Write a protein that binds this ligand. Structure first.
Ligand SMILES: CC(C)CN(C[C@@H](O)[C@H](Cc1ccccc1)NC(=O)O[C@H]1CO[C@H]2OCC[C@H]21)S(=O)(=O)c1ccc(N)cc1
Lengths: 99, 99
């Protein structure tokens, strides 16, 4: 599909068997989500943004459905005001910026 | 331009006759630049990012030039890790997300 940006590019995702929505974010290297329930082991990570640093759980190689296509990639889990799909997953469903 | 997201989608941008470069960010509604030499008065603004809320200087109706393409809008100045051009400006180039 071809999304414009007169409003937040928000789309459905499925994570942990659960239906959700997230902002398709080209700003960040990695994906972040609202506290959720997930597979296995995570690493501590510190991301930085606007408003300083925030502590996240790094779940590695996780299965997620974005817009209905399967992707396995890194999901960061932490206190994000909103769910954010990073470049890391966007490139696997052939997302590209068009202008 | 169809641009893939393996890298940061950094493009060239011109303000005040200053060449710099900025992230084509679809996760930011607003355009946020670290410093500019714009000549005078700015307006006090608050945006929230992922790590909290920050003071930033709002400039109305700035002529800016992205990839040669001259467009006009509101250019904040703020504590951003990376120059970010958000959707308010990306719509004026008719830029879209695509997959
Ligand atoms: C400036 C960015 C480099 C900061 N981030 C990406 C950015 O998309 C966030 C992502 C984002 C999206 C929605 C809500 C909060 C954060 N948005 C943001 O704060 O940008 C600001 C520009 O204008 C304002 O409009 C919305 C946010 C403000 S980030 O959220 O911190 C970020 C940091 C690390 C990762 N891995 C992924 C994302």
């Amino acid at each position: 599909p071809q999304i414009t940006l007169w409003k937040r590019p928000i789309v459905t995702i499925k994570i942990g068997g659960q239906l959700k929505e997230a902002l398709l974010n080209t700003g960040a290297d990695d994906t972040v989500l609202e506290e959720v329930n997930l597979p296995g082991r995570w690493k501590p990570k510190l991301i930085g943004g606007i408003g300083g640093f925030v502590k996240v759980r790094q779940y590695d190689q996780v299965p997620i459905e974005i817009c209905g296509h399967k992707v396995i990639g890194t999901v960061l889990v932490g206190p994000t005001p909103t769910n954010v799909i990073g470049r890391n997953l966007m490139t696997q469903i052939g997302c590209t910026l068009n202008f």
